[PDB]
């Protein structure tokens, strides 16, 4: 739902 | 070269932090450097870490 976060990249 | 930039940022933050640390609240009377006396060990350490003979 939230999508992709900065830490998840 | 990106390691050097990170080290620059770290040192700049450290210098700002120590400038804040030496700075105090409402200004008081100042003891001049010309009237006080410093030891030789601190001078030797500072001149060594600066990179002089």
């Amino acid at each position: 739902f939230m999508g992709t976060l900065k830490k998840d990249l | 070269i990106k390691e050097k930039a990170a080290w620059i940022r770290n040192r700049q933050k450290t210098m700002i932090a120590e400038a804040r640390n030496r700075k105090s609240l409402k200004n008081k009377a100042i003891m001049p450097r010309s009237k006080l006396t410093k030891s030789f060990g601190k001078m030797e350490e500072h001149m060594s870490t600066l990179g002089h003979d």
Binding site: - | N10, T14, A17, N21, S24, L25
Partner: protein, 72 residues
Amino acid sequence: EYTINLHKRLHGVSFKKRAPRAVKEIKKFAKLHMRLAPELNQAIWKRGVKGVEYRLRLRISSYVEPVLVASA
């Protein structure tokens, strides 16, 4: 070199006595793991009785001193 989280230890204390109590906390702190430097007292009182931040970095030798770090 230890990290003290004074946010947790000063929680609930009256805001008029936060800075002095932190002094008693650090003395307690060094008692749990192991005289406070005047530089440490200055760091504690850097913002008055409504002062002490959430985290501090100390060096304990017992003699307890503040250390210069960019962030804690």
